[PDB]
Amino acid sequence: PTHLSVDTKFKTEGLCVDIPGIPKDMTYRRLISMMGFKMNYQVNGYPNMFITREEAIRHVRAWIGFDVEGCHGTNLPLQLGFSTGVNLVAVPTPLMYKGLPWNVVRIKIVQMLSDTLKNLSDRVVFVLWAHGFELTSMKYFVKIGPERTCCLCDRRATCFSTASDTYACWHHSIGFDYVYNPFMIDVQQWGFTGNLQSNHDLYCQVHGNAHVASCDAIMTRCLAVHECFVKRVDWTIEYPIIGDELKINAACRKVQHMVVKAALLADKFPVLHDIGNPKAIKCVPQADVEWKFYDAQPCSDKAYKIEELFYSYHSDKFTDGVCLFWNCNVDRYPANSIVCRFDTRVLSNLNLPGCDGGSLYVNKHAFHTPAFDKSAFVNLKQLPFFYYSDSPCESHGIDYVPLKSATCITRCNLGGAVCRHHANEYRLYLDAYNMMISAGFSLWVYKQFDTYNLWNTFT
């Protein structure tokens, strides 16, 4: 049961206003035929245009909400809306485009999907709240057949060109006019009461209904993200490497060790309260401090209320020492904290738009993250960049320019001249730091944190 059987039943009630008289008894096999596509008993990698909820979740990076609204049905213009915010008007003859024939609309769809998806996925999954017009419009810009490879590379084909009779992936599709072998899922098949807007608005206030097709497309995809990543969470699902995932994760571990080690050296806290991932390990294993762990899985819906994490009767005294919240998202951090908080507003290939201001951060696993909120950090300050090292000044073993920097907290810098080892390590650390920040992570610390307190650790 890897793929969705074409003989599975499709509920047609949501389609009967656009398609009156539609049979109640319907399979994906008959629906695909009604849509004008012919499968031809083909076991060549494309068993069904529609996919299961499980297959959709594995391909969340490919999700593109799609809605079609009748402007005036073969005789009337259609408004094609996508979760990218694009609206195209196709004539049968929040970016809005004037009425144009299908032969040119299809070229724009291919360009838009290719630019949106080339750095995200090997395919497209059209996320629908199917009412009819969207399914009957697909024959005008979609071609199907056996699974194919790109004419210029080894990636699977996502586009077809009627001009050259060739196939291309999202990276090599310039000038292509048909979407080839797309996938799709109808959110209405999951069991819902009432319309799209009423279900969407139960969980989200950030997307409105400006009464255009792209608004519906955005709400449809937001509702699907809510159902699959907020109300239901699966950390077993692995996602492929598409960018700097490995460097980002390594940078996060390097920064965590640095910041916590320096906070413990600078303020000598007798106890550290490590709140968050139940599989956390001590990030500064050689530190003297009493290390106490508190389990909290990553919150996917709303940030944790500090009152619920700390109260209702553990050291009990979280006010003693320091609290470490490494990606443990709370409504208001206590004043004695060290925090790493993902900024959902960051633009990247790893960060997808999410539900109610949240974002879906996909890096090995999918993490729906509640909306970034500057008021969570009112008791703290931004953690400035610094590099600290107590390791010996010794090279061992890449050409050099002498390092001069007030933030290189080492014995050699205290002595007036940064050594080659500490200059190389500082530059590698700065690159790791910049990688983590650019990925969207933000760092915050208790207001008394002062790197001037690190210089006396060199006695």
Look at residue 422 and give the partner it binds from ligand U1V, Zn ion, none, a contact being a CB closer than 5 to 8 Å depending on partner kind. Answer: Zn ion
**Residue 132, CA distances (Å) to 17, 34, 82, 304 in order:** 8, 11, 16, 41
Neighbour-count burial of 374, counting CB atoms closer than 10 A to its CB (0-12 exposed, 13-18 middle, 19+ buried): exposed
Look at residue 169 and give the partner it binds from Zn ion, ligand U1V, none, a contact being a CB closer than 5 to 8 Å depending on partner kind. Answer: Zn ion
Span 262-301, contacts to ligand U1V by CB under 6 A: 298-299
- Which parts are annotated binding residues? 67, 69, 134, 150, 153, 169, 172, 200, 204, 207, 211, 216, 222, 274-280, 393, 412, 419, 422
Catalytic residue flag (residue 290) = no
Retrieve residue 273's tokens: 């309260």
106 or 226, CB closer to ligand U1V? 226
Span 322-381, contacts to ligand U1V by CB under 6 A: 327, 329, 342, 361, 367, 369
345 or 404, CB closer to ligand U1V? 345
Catalytic residue flag (residue 69) = yes
CB of 276 to ligand U1V, least distance (A): 8
Measured in degrees and rounded to the nearest 5, phi and psi for residue 143 equal -125, 145
CB of 142 to ligand U1V, least distance (A): 34
Look at residue 350 and give the partner it binds from ligand U1V, Zn ion, none, a contact being a CB closer than 5 to 8 Å depending on partner kind. Answer: none
Is residue 196 part of the contact set for Zn ion (CB under 5 A)? no
Q: Which of 71, 361, 111 is nearest to 225 (CA)?
A: 361
48 or 329, CB closer to ligand U1V? 329
Catalytic residue flag (residue 308) = no
Span 17-36, contacts to ligand U1V by CB under 6 A: none
Catalytic residue flag (residue 115) = no
**Residue 145, CA distances (Å) to 46, 62, 247, 253, 399 in order:** 7, 19, 39, 46, 55
Catalytic residue flag (residue 13) = no
3-state secondary structure of 162: coil
Look at residue 393 and give the partner it binds from Zn ion, ligand U1V, none, a contact being a CB closer than 5 to 8 Å depending on partner kind. Answer: Zn ion
Containing 388, the helix (H) or strand (E) segment is: strand 387-388
Question: Which residue out of 18, 59, 67, 356 is catalytically annotated?
Answer: 67
Q: Which of 324, 319, 444, 435 is nearest to 383 (CA)?
A: 444
By beta carbon distance, the residue nearest ligand U1V is 298
Would you say 291 and 263 are in contact if contact means Cβ atoms under 8 Å apart?
no
Q: How many residues bind ligand U1V (CB under 6 A)?
A: 8
Q: In this structure, are strands 380-382 and 351-353 parallel, antiparallel, or unpaired?
A: unpaired
CB of 426 to Zn ion, least distance (A): 9
220 or 336, CB closer to Zn ion? 220
Would you say 37 and 49 are in contact if contact means Cβ atoms under 8 Å apart?
yes
Would you say 421 and 396 are in contact if contact means Cβ atoms under 8 Å apart?
yes
| Distance, CA of 311 to CA of 301 (rounded, Å) | 21
CB of 293 to ligand U1V, least distance (A): 16
Q: Which of 104, 153, 210, 246 binds Zn ion (CB under 5 A)?
A: 153
- Which parts are annotated binding residues for S-adenosyl-L-methionine? 274-280
Q: Which of 207, 261, 341, 368 binds Zn ion (CB under 5 A)?
A: 207
Angle between helices 245-267 and 420-438 (to 10 degrees): 110
145 or 353, CB closer to ligand U1V? 353
Retrieve residue 271's tokens: 């106890």
Tokens 């974002």 — which residue? 359
Span 163-182, contacts to Zn ion by CB under 5 A: 169, 172
Q: Which of 255, 325, 263 is nearest to 294 (CA)?
A: 325
- Which parts are annotated binding residues for Zn(2+)? 150, 153, 169, 172, 200, 204, 207, 222, 393, 412, 419, 422
Residues 6+ apart with CB under 8 A from 72: none
Residues preceding gaps in the chain (C to N > 2.5 Å): 72, 93, 313, 397
Would you say 13 and 133 are in contact if contact means Cβ atoms under 8 Å apart?
no
Span 210-239, contacts to Zn ion by CB under 5 A: 222
CB of 428 to Zn ion, least distance (A): 14
Q: Which of 15, 62, 419, 454 binds Zn ion (CB under 5 A)?
A: 419
The residues of the shown chain that bind ligand U1V, judged by CB under 6 A, are: 298-299, 327, 329, 342, 361, 367, 369
Point out the residues that are catalytic. Answer: 67, 69, 134, 211, 216
The residues of the shown chain that bind Zn ion, judged by CB under 5 A, are: 150, 152-153, 155, 169, 172, 204, 207, 222, 393, 410, 412, 419, 422
